[PDB]
């Protein structure tokens, strides 16, 4: 097989759909297929030689010309689209292309919001899609609710060993524990001013707790912000993958406070899959990689002093956290690629068939 892939982010910053099309390209060449992923020009980043570049949005005539012309040239057995949402690259993609269509849609809100948005004008292009994916059953219910025709639930993956075997960050772990952060902490949807607010508590019993903080912020505001206790911050910046993942593993605690926005918890699977406890605001999507309270700790979504004792019962507890943990390790292997890569693939050849290739509009 030869797959084209369309990523309508920059690689120039992380995020949950930028990583899940390089890591899942990575995969797909592994068991012995081409892949090409078309993505915004991300100059910033060293990425392998079979990224191409769609120009960047000011999206131009150049860019439309790019991808008329790697569709046409690509030769792909299946075109797999990422967030087709109107206006970008993966839409422009939809429209340029017809054939062997997959979509991947990682974002959702409302029934409602699905329901226009793929019943509106955009309609005779969501049609041309013929394998649909969506990251939750619910999501997938409304796709299905909307457009007649069946999609698939298939979860976002992680590689699970590269967290479970990940090195230890050195001085760790700390004998007055780490809670970890993951995120852009000055969207207030991330939940930050909830962890900052559980602080006081935190440190009236952990007297020497760090806030390790993995994500690109303003330190100087967050830090005005925990006044006296500002001292128990450690920004760790936009570090790469690989300390990310000691991270990730040499923490006691990883801390989803987020306040919605979230429509998968992949940060959270990451942290199952380092054996790292998690304590999670509960939104659904965090539910649902918690599996309702048994292979993680969650808390209400805008509970400050809920937030506090949730984490110091996890770190007082060690029999309770163990517990999490080994559940956790548990189930993450439902995320993990070996599993994900399948099921996408199965699409891929429900989709797909002997020399037929998609083609330009
Ligand atoms: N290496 C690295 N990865 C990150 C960073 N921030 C987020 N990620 C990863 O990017 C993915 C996206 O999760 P998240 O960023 O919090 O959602 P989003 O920013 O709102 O798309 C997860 O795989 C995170 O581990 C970072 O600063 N460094």
């Not at 297929?33 to 910033?44: D, G, I, N, T, W």
């Not at 570090?239 to 801390?255: E, G, L, N």
């Amino acid at each position: 097989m030869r797959i084209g892939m369309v990523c309508p982010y920059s690689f120039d910053v992380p995020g949950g759909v930028q990583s899940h099309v390089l890591q899942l390209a990575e995969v797909l060449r592994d068991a012995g297929h081409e892949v090409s992923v078309l993505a915004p020009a991300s100059p910033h980043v060293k990425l392998p030689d079979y990224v191409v570049s769609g120009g960047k949005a000011v999206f131009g005539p150049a860019t439309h010309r790019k991808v008329k012309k790697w569709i046409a040239e690509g030769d792909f057995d299946v075109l797999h689209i990422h967030e087709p949402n109107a206006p970008s690259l993966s839409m422009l993609a939809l429209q340029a292309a017809e054939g062997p269509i997959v979509a991947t849609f990682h974002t959702s809100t409302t029934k409602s919001l699905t329901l226009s948005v793929f019943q509106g004008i955009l309609r005779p292009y969501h049609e041309k899609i013929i394998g649909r994916i969506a990251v939750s059953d619910l999501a997938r219910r409304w796709q299905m609710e909307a457009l007649g025709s069946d999609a698939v639930e298939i979860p976002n993956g992680v590689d699970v060993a590269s967290f479970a075997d990940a090195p230890l960050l050195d001085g760790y772990p700390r004998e007055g524990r780490t809670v970890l952060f993951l995120g852009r902490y000055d969207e207030p949807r991330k939940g930050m001013a909830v962890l900052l607010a559980a602080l006081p508590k935190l440190v009236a019993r952990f007297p020497d707790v760090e806030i390790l903080i993995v994500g690109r912020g303003d330190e100087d505001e967050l830090r005005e912000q925990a006044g006296d206790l500002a001292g128990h911050l450690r920004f760790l910046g936009q570090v790469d993958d690989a300390t990310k993942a000691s991270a990730m593993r040499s923490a006691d605690v990883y801390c989803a406070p987020h306040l919605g926005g979230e429509s998968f918890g992949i940060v959270l699977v990451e942290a199952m899959a380092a054996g790292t406890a998690v304590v999670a605001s509960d939104l659904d999507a965090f539910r649902r990689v918690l599996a309702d309270g048994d292979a993680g700790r969650l808390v209400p979504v805008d509970d400050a002093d809920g937030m506090a004792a949730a984490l110091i019962g996890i770190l007082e507890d060690d029999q309770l956290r163990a517990g999490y943990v080994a559940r956790a390790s548990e189930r993450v292997h439902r995320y993990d690629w070996s599993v994900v890569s399948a099921q996408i693939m199965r699409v891929y050849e429900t989709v797909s068939g002997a020399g037929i290739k998609v083609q330009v509009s």
